[PDB]
């Protein structure tokens, strides 16, 4: 689509957070377009990046492809700027052959939107407790 | 958590398909999750695992991985049972550090549950367009 | 048996706290399998792990292996994280062979679960007074 | 196992005002949505609202929504309902429910409950 | 509201005999191809018990003498032959809407 602004709602455990995201330009070496949040220096933001890949000789299907990444800031004594102590990471990735119809494509979408919502995924990630 | 029935609701690219997802036990070689759907035939079923990986001395970083895939059925000419055609994957991996706190792991769980279904990645996904 | 939560009660110096423990898988290479406790900074985890041989035809010892640590915390200043000051180790491994019964077992369980609340052993590792 | 055990109670006349709460021990309580559930002494099951994971989405019934809220507390596993303005036909036991995985739950676990007037 | 009518009000079997109870929904209730009616039991002085959810599937805890069929309107629980445990009230549950009513119930 158009790299616009992204008002991200709802977000947070508790819910009532907003998460902000400014375009940051597609890049001419991979595709990537790049997302990050609105207002902070660069290389202390959270980032959004997203790609979307064509068959070719090597592979026979499409490939999307969304990777996040948001660090952690440490004021630490003694020093104006903050470092960065962690990062914590998600990337998805898709696959769609070339047969695939639209309703299939939007079926795995909201399939995996929805998973992250329940008791087996909350508590698998914000936990790390294993399914038993 | 405990494995019982996820049933998931409003999916789909109008909002109004459901997919309940009956539980099929956790693997001991390798601690993943598996529920299924409710088919006979095992390799027409919708099929998702999830697996939480500790630190070995390896690796240093905890790793959520939840995976999906999704199969398509007909059947052809001269042929009486459905057989398979298609497949539509997803493969969501989380890694997270011994220091991070819940609500940065629960930041990006609700992160990613709120790109999924913004109008720059429901247009990269249903319709397959690179976001420029 | 299979894993589950474990709720721990009446335990501590005066007898009124508790101890929650989550499962979090079996190691697959030595089958150790694990327990923890519900801690957010997963570095900092009251964590209790249980190790028995497998039954096999040809074994001719068999070896039960429970463990605990337990760390604590130290806000150090000039840092974000809190690190672990401290452990506090303990080590069980019970040792039996393959004509042993389950009463001369049982009664060795029962006989060192009775032992630590006598006042031999609440003043041999409580004030680490030896006997004499 | 899981285990709720609900407290509150009482005879209280019309008008007053209550809050239940529920001790939900024997598993990750802010994992799971939670519930409330009523039943009348004329031995009929009613529902009185849902509360999401993390306490953002809320479902109110009817005869609830304009004088009760719901609220939880996941640092102290509790389950609360505040209670006003008790218009004489919520007589009923209000069980505590635990919420299945799923989009609006079939209340797989259940509790004793706690006489209200 | 969709209001499940139970079809008796109370009903009376020996050790032998099978047992039926039926609920008649007001609308549609399977929505994709599942169908979202679920099964209680009551002890009188217990809390309700869950039987069979998605009315097709037995709860771990049920011990399997107990079955559900249906579609869209009317939807049974048959109980091959019926024990000493077996005699309590049964309510069934809507899941497909908000409101979530529930049933009159009947009792054994």
């Known amino acids: 689509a158009k790299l616009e602004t992204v008002t991200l709602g709802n977000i947070g455990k508790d819910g009532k957070q907003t998460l902000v995201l400014n375009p940051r330009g597609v890049n001419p070496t991979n595709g990537v377009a790049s997302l990050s949040q609105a207002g902070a220096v660069p290389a202390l933001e959270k980032r959004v990046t997203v790609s979307v890949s064509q068959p070719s000789r090597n592979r026979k299907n499409y490939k999307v492809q969304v990777k996040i990444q948001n660090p952690t800031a440490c004021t630490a004594n003694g020093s104006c700027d903050p470092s960065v102590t962690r990062q914590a990471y998600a990337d998805v990735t898709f696959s769609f052959t070339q047969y695939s119809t639209d309703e299939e494509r939007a079926f795995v979408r909201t399939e995996l939107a929805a998973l992250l919502a329940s008791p087996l995924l909350i508590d698998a990630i914000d936990q790390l407790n294993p399914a038993y | 958590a405990k494995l019982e029935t996820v049933t998931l609701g409003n999916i789909g690219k109008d909002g109004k398909q459901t997919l309940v997802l009956n539980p099929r036990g956790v693997n001991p070689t390798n601690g993943v999750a598996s529920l299924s759907q409710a088919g006979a035939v095992p390799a027409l079923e919708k099929r998702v695992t999830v697996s939480v990986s500790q630190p070995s001395r390896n690796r240093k970083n905890y790793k959520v991985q939840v995976k999906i895939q999704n199969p398509t059925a007909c059947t052809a000419n001269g042929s009486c049972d459905p057989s398979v055609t298609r497949q539509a994957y997803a493969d969501v991996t989380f890694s997270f550090t011994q220091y991070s706190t819940d609500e940065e792991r629960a930041f990006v769980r609700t992160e990613l549950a709120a790109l999924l279904a913004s109008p720059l990645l429901i247009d990269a996904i249903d319709q397959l367009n690179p976001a420029y | 048996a299979k894993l589950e939560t474990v709720t721990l009660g009446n335990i501590g110096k005066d007898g009124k706290q508790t101890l929650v423990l989550n499962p979090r898988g079996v190691n697959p290479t030595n089958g150790v399998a694990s327990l923890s406790q519900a801690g957010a900074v997963p570095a900092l985890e009251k964590r209790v792990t249980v190790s028995v041989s497998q039954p096999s035809r040809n074994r001719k010892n068999y070896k039960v292996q429970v463990k605990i640590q337990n760390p604590t915390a130290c806000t150090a200043n000039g840092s974000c994280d809190p690190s672990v000051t401290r452990q506090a180790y303990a080590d069980v491994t019970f040792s039996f062979t393959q004509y042993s019964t389950d009463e001369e077992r049982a009664f060795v369980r029962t006989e060192l679960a009775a032992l630590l609340a006598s006042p031999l052993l609440i003043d041999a590792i409580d004030q680490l007074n030896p006997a004499y | 196992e899981v285990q709720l055990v609900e407290s509150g109670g009482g005879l209280v006349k019309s008008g007053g005002s209550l809050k239940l709460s529920c001790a939900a021990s024997?598993?990750?309580?802010?994992?799971?949505?939670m519930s409330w559930v009523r039943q009348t002494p004329e031995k009929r099951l009613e529902w009185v609202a849902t509360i999401s994971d993390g306490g953002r989405y809320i479902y109110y019934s009817d005869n609830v929504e304009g004088r009760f809220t719901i609220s939880r507390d996941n640092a102290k596993n509790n389950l609360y309902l505040q209670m006003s303005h008790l218009k004489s036909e919520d007589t009923a036991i209000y069980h505590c429910?635990?919420?299945?995985?799923?989009?609006?739950?079939?209340?797989?676990?259940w509790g004793q409950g706690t006489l209200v007037t | 509201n969709i209001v499940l009518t139970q079809s008796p009000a109370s009903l009376a079997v020996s050790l032998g005999q099978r047992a039926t109870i039926s609920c008649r929904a007001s609308e549609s209730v399977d929505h994709s191809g599942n169908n979202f009616i679920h099964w209680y039991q009551q002890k009188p002085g217990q809390p309700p018990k869950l039987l069979i959810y998605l009315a097709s599937h037995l709860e771990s805890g049920v011990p399997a003498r107990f079955s559900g069929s249906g579609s869209r309107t009317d939807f049974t629980l048959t109980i091959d032959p019926v024990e000493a445990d077996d005699f309590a009230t049964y309510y069934c549950?809507?899941?497909?809407?908000?409101?979530?009513?529930f049933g009159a119930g009947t009792k054994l």
């Open positions: 549950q809507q899941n497909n809407e908000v409101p979530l009513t």
């Open positions: 429910a635990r919420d299945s995985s799923g989009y609006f739950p079939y209340f797989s676990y």
């Open positions: 024997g598993f990750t309580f802010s994992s799971y949505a």
